[PDB]
Amino acid sequence: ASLVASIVEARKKRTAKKNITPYQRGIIRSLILTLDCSEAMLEKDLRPNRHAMIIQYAIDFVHEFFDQNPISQMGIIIMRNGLAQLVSQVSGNPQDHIDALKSIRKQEPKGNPSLQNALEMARGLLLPVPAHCTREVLIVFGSLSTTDPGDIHQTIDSLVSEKIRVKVLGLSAQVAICKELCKATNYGDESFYKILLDETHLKELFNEAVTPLPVNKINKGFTLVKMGFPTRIFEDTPTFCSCHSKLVYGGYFCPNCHSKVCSLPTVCPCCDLMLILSTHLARSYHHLMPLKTFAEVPTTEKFRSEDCFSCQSRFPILTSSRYRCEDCKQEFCVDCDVFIHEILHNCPGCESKPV
Amino acid sequence: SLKHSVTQYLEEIPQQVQNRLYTSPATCLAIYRILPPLAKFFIMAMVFNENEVPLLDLDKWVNSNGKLQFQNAIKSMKSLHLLIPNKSSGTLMINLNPTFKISLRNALTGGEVQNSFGVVVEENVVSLDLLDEYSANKWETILHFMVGTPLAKIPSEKVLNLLKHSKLMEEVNSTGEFKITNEGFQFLLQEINSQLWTLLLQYLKMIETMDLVDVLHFIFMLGALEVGKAYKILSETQRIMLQDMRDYGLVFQKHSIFYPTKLALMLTSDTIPDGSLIVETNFKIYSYSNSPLQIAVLSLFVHLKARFVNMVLGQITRESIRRALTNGITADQIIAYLETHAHPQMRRLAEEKLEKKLELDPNCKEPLQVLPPTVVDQIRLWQLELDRVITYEGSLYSDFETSQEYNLLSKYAQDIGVLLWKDDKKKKFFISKEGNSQVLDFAKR
Amino acid sequence: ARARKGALVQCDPSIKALILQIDAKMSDIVLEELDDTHLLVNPSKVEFVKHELNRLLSKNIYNPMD
Amino acid sequence: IPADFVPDSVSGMFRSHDFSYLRLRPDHASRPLWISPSDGRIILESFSPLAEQAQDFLVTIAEPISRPSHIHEYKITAYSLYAAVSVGLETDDIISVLDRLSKVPVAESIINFIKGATISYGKVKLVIKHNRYFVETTQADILQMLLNDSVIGVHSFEIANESVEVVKKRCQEIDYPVLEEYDFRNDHRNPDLDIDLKPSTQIRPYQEKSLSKMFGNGRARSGIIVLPCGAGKTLVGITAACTIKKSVIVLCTSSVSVMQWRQQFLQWCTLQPENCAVFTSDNKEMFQTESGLVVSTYSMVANTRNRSHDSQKVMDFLTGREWGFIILDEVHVVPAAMFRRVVSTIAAHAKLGLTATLVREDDKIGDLNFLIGPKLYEANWMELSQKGHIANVQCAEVWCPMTAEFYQEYLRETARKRMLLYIMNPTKFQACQFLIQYHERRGDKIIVFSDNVYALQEYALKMGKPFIYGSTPQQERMNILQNFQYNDQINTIFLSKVGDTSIDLPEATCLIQISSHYGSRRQEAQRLGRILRAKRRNDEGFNAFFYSLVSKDTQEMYYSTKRQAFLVDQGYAFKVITHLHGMENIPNLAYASPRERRELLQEVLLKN
Numbered sequence A: 001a002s003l004v005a006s007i008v009e010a011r012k013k014r015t016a017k018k019n020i021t022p023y024q025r026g027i028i029r030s031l032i033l034t035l036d037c038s039e040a041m042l043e044k045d046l047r048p049n050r051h052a053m054i055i056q057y058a059i060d061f062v063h064e065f066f067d068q069n070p071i072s073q074m075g076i077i078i079m080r081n082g083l084a085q086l087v088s089q090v091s092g093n094p095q096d097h098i099d100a101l102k103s104i105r106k107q108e109p110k111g112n113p114s115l116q117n118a119l120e121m122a123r124g125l126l127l128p129v130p131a132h133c134t135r136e137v138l139i140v141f142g143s144l145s146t147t148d149p150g151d152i153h154q155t156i157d158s159l160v161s162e163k164i165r166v167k168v169l170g171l172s173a174q175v176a177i178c179k180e181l182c183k184a185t186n187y188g189d190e191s192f193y194k195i196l197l198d199e200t201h202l203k204e205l206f207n208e209a210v211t212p213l214p215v216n217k218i219n220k221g222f223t224l225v226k227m228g229f230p231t232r233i234f235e236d237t238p239t240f241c242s243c244h245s246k247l248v249y250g251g252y253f254c255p256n257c258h259s260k261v262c263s264l265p266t267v268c269p270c271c272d273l274m275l276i277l278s279t280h281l282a283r284s285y286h287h288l289m290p291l292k293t294f295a296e297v298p299t300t301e302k303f304r305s306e307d308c309f310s311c312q313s314r315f316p317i318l319t320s321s322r323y324r325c326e327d328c329k330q331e332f333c334v335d336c337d338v339f340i341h342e343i344l345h346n347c348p349g350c351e352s353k354p355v
Numbered sequence B: 001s002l003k004h005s006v007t008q009y010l011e012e013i014p015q016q017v018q019n020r021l022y023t024s025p026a027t028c029l030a031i032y033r034i035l036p037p038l039a040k041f042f043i044m045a046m047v048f049n050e051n052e053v054p055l056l057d058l059d060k061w062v063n064s065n066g067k068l069q070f071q072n073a074i075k076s077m078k079s080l081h082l083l084i085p086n087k088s089s090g091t092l093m094i095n096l097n098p099t100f101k102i103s104l105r106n107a108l109t110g111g112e113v114q115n116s117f118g119v120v121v122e123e124n125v126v127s128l129d130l131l132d133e134y135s136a137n138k139w140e141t142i143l144h145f146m147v148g149t150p151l152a153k154i155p156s157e158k159v160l161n162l163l164k165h166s167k168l169m170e171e172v173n174s175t176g177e178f179k180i181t182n183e184g185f186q187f188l189l190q191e192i193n194s195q196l197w198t199l200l201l202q203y204l205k206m207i208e209t210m211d212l213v214d215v216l217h218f219i220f221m222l223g224a225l226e227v228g229k230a231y232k233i234l235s236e237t238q239r240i241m242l243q244d245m246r247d248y249g250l251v252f253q254k255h256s257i258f259y260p261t262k263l264a265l266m267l268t269s270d271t272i273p274d275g276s277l278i279v280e281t282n283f284k285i286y287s288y289s290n291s292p293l294q295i296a297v298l299s300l301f302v303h304l305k306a307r308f309v310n311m312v313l314g315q316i317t318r319e320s321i322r323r324a325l326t327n328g329i330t331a332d333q334i335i336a337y338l339e340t341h342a343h344p345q346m347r348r349l350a351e352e353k354l355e356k357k358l359e360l361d362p363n364c365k366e367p368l369q370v371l372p373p374t375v376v377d378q379i380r381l382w383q384l385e386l387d388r389v390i391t392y393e394g395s396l397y398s399d400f401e402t403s404q405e406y407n408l409l410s411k412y413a414q415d416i417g418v419l420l421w422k423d424d425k426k427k428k429f430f431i432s433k434e435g436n437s438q439v440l441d442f443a444k445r
Numbered sequence C: 001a002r003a004r005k006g007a008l009v010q011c012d013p014s015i016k017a018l019i020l021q022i023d024a025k026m027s028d029i030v031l032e033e034l035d036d037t038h039l040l041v042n043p044s045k046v047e048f049v050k051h052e053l054n055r056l057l058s059k060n061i062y063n064p065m066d
Numbered sequence D: 001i002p003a004d005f006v007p008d009s010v011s012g013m014f015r016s017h018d019f020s021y022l023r024l025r026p027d028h029a030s031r032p033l034w035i036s037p038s039d040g041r042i043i044l045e046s047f048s049p050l051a052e053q054a055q056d057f058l059v060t061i062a063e064p065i066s067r068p069s070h071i072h073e074y075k076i077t078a079y080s081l082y083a084a085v086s087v088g089l090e091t092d093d094i095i096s097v098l099d100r101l102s103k104v105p106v107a108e109s110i111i112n113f114i115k116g117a118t119i120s121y122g123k124v125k126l127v128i129k130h131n132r133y134f135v136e137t138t139q140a141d142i143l144q145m146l147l148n149d150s151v152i153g154v155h156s157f158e159i160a161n162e163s164v165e166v167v168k169k170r171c172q173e174i175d176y177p178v179l180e181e182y183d184f185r186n187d188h189r190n191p192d193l194d195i196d197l198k199p200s201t202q203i204r205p206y207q208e209k210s211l212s213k214m215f216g217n218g219r220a221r222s223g224i225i226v227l228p229c230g231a232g233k234t235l236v237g238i239t240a241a242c243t244i245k246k247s248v249i250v251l252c253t254s255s256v257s258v259m260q261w262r263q264q265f266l267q268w269c270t271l272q273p274e275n276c277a278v279f280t281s282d283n284k285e286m287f288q289t290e291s292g293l294v295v296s297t298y299s300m301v302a303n304t305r306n307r308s309h310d311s312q313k314v315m316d317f318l319t320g321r322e323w324g325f326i327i328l329d330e331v332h333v334v335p336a337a338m339f340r341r342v343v344s345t346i347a348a349h350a351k352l353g354l355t356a357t358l359v360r361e362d363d364k365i366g367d368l369n370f371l372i373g374p375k376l377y378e379a380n381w382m383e384l385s386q387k388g389h390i391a392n393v394q395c396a397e398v399w400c401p402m403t404a405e406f407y408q409e410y411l412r413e414t415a416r417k418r419m420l421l422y423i424m425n426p427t428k429f430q431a432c433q434f435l436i437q438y439h440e441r442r443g444d445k446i447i448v449f450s451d452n453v454y455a456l457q458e459y460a461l462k463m464g465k466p467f468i469y470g471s472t473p474q475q476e477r478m479n480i481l482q483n484f485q486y487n488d489q490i491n492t493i494f495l496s497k498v499g500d501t502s503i504d505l506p507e508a509t510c511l512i513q514i515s516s517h518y519g520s521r522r523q524e525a526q527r528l529g530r531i532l533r534a535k536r537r538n539d540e541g542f543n544a545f546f547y548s549l550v551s552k553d554t555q556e557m558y559y560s561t562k563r564q565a566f567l568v569d570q571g572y573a574f575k576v577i578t579h580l581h582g583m584e585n586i587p588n589l590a591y592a593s594p595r596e597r598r599e600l601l602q603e604v605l606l607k608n
């Protein structure tokens, strides 16, 4: 009787994903993850302790964020002992923040949090940020309270005025002030103050936070942006780099001012212009071109085919596991449905079918 | 060391005898299977063009990161006389063995094979019902014979003589009984293709002129053969040892049509799990495995209780431990079996403990044993407590003078491999009786 | 200036004192005491001494468990 | 054997052990039970269904031989079947449930064994009427056969109090066992004691199971209840007394235990300190109330060598009182010959036995069947360890390498002094000093156990922290105990056979053993139970630490193996440590120099 429970669970899951929309979603991102390292995360209540798992999950979050969206800079400020401590400036290299987080590994989480100080200096760090960049902050929190020097509502008003959004991933339960932050910052939405139920749910939440977010019509900033593809050289001689001032065998060359760099996707240090590859911009095209869900045909009706169109395996036989791409009119197995919907970003049935 | 042993044997085989072995495509195919990936790539590249190459071109092609492995490949290539490297025009002119080259070429093209892949009759039948069943029967008989548990179907007299002569499972004539040597337990620990290759290496070593290259070529094509078909009964020496390996149960022969079982395929190549055992501090056995062969081999070194479907239970006793020890069976052999019979949950727990102890200290101030020492070191402590002495018997030279001379004589013995023990601090050393005369002669000179 | 015919044994002070007790209950087999880790013994009685040593640690433990 | 069972070639050392002749049911996946008919053993899976329902049934009708995490080795015994039918169970139901949940066909010998182990339940009973052991059986059918027995010499007749133990042994021998289920509600001949279960006491589930197994009928079934260390046996006895509401006497084998159980009893039950009169050489007062309690240890009833007249008056008073309930806490010592006068002296109806270990050197533990009765309940030790009712220990057995400095004298020492000579190894002193350093570095309270007072005091003096043994007076030992508990000057102490058992010292999560008995397993088990009742047995990431410094090259390895094998079979393993940690990283080592080693050698040569 487990298949009936699985079917009704899949129905209640798919009721949320019935509506799939091609919203304009931010690509030039600006993501900040502040960390609290206080007495609450010293609890071993989840194995091994909250500090260790948020360290590991932040490592994964950095990797996933830079993989999916390499067109953003990442800054991390830790919270400790009534002080918020900047440990990671916004940068294109994830490895810097990886090393900073590795420093955070060995040190000891202790103290009390101050979202006022944390969000204030996060605002100040987010101040010299260009218009197209979408300023947004992830906040992790384990306390049920917050010691603060002054008002939080002035900070809330300033953050709303400066067009920065937040998303809170609280640990224990809901905190009303964090609900207020999420609602007021997020145009009244309640889809940003999220509480885990276990570590797997925390993993899923982090994966959800990886994704780009849609933007609002009223928050209109539709413009152009200057761009430059550089050229890579492979020289015999080591050559001084502009950024780190040291001898480099290879390195890209600046398309505009003909200097050289060491890493991409990065902006020029000399002509001060952003340099990318077409792979980097095409990386988010699945977000730009979403994929429709695939429908299982019912077991009662007559079937177009009895084996999987894509992976080429036999469909198993009570119910019918034939997920149909209505855009290509072909049914598929669950494994292929998962792979095409998540890993792949094209429908080979729609590739074979001519338009 | 199976490929090492066979390669060593073929290096012992002289150059023109090797070239005779390189004549036929089936032998060349099997030998190509033996060669490491670099040399395999080299010969498949050069086999389709009659352009000899100098060593410099190959060296320029080779990335220097794996240059040691390249050296190993070409050392095997030259020492097998598969290469003809001559310093032509001052450059070590590289040349593959041409008979090997053309026979590989014909094998790859499907050209002239001269039925080296087999004089085919192609009267295919079912093999799971006759060939596999007779093969499993005969192999079960010889396997329980080699275990020592009683079984009526004795092996052939040829293999019986080979066991009598060889140091494998000693048929001690004073006792009249096959007895588990340490080499016998090594054979027991061996993989099935390892056992087959040891058997054929021993049989080839003992067999003399019976043409040795006929046996070699026939063995290589027999490995090259496929299951479940009739074939023509060829050389007569090949035919009579073919009847011999029929009596081993390798082939299902109807006295001219013969039907090779799956054992030829396993001889050619290999194909909470089975064979996975959960260790216990209480020495209880939670095997995820069962066979009467499993019980028969566990009877030698484990006190068991009963047999159930996969669940073979028991308790390892020190009586069982010392029963293994007194046979000459090595505790290293015992832990070879044990560490080849570990279980997923316990090895995951061991790796979790290892990664926990890695961050605390690199040494951890613990003995080096990855398998969990709560159960595993108890045998290993019993292993160290088993031998725990060093015995030197026979001649001994004492009270040296000059340290010079002591080091010279002791170093000389080490070079010739006759030194058994030495102590700088006492200026004394012990040498084997065999090397006594050589050491004395060197001392005088 | 001597070279006597003996069997050198790697040993310990404890298990050398056990060798001395072996000499006490029948003497004259073990030739001389070289150092704490070395001894010289009659080559004809090396495995007689070994089996009696086996009896010695049998009397130490015997691992009966019956 | 449900087969021909032609003997296999691999069944030679299977001397009737090859259990494949059974026709295994296809429901072997669901059913968790095998039967081993060769020795009566039972093989039980810990990963198949019906085991949760069958676990209490197998405890009731069978005894476990070994219970590791994967397979439980049980064994049906006639003792356990008598316990089953005493709880209220029968052979036919046992056979039916066994075939219901058994993967294998039920063996003929096991069927016959359970058929034989069915008692005349209810036929043979005894009551007390005015301190009068009246053998009140339901029929004269019992009277005919019992008078047919030559020992004896609805309807009730007298058997003398010392003759009661002998006739209980005899009736167990002829398999006519007596049940002692007091109708304390129906009997009002005894003075009822107005003691109530306070709402401040609420009972653990396994303790409720223990009560209801001996309170199935509402009467108090008399027997043994074996619970681990710190399980709440005092709470179980308090609950039994409060639901009996009669005059009750409980004796434990220490005046400190007298003193602690008296305060426990006046704490968690509504009996009054007036009703409780404590009997010892401190004071021998009596309560004059119709109902109440008098507590003493077993010594003030056993002894007749040096007794006071007030002691004589008190033991006369307790002889006069016909009690309704008796509990012999720490029941492992009462079947000793000077201690088994309990039936001969005290007139008490219900006889309950609460203890931690149900094992000893001899077979006096089975005499409790005809002294107090069978085991009414036991709690599974590893189940309570995972439940947090008792602790989880990372025991580390230290194989100290023997020094030849002490071995040279140990081999030539005479037998009475070889023991004290190999306890005192300087290498053991070095290892103990670094271990104390390392665990005070970890911040653990450490208690050191030595079997000898001189070794205990020498180790204590080399530490610079005091010692407690059996010859130390009570005032000095409690002063040292409070100094250890509260004073930070006394970080560790040096305990002995007054610390091995019958005390409440659970703070020491770290324990280092430098010496023990020759072969007494119960002393080592109680020493383990000293830290098994530790307070931080419930927090995450906890593992208690047990250490045994044992000299190599001796028989002490076999001695420690013998002493530890019960705990290993329980599930408390003893891991192998020979090369210790921090060896030489410790600067300053006790008797490190060889001159110091020879100094301590000749210092102990002064005694040995």
Ligand SMILES: [Mg+2]
Pocket: D468, D469, D470, D494, D495, D496, D497, D498, D499, D500
């Ligand atoms: Mg004590």
Ligand SMILES: [Zn+2]
Pocket: A241, A242, A243, A244, A245, A246, A261, A262
């Ligand atoms: Zn650079």
Ligand SMILES: [Zn+2]
Pocket: A254, A255, A256, A257, A258, A259, A268, A269, A270, A271, A272, A273
């Ligand atoms: Zn530039």
Ligand SMILES: [Zn+2]
Pocket: A308, A309, A310, A311, A312, A313, A332, A333, A334, A335, A336, A337
């Ligand atoms: Zn598919």
Ligand SMILES: [Zn+2]
Pocket: A325, A326, A327, A328, A329, A330, A347, A348, A349, A350
């Ligand atoms: Zn499609």
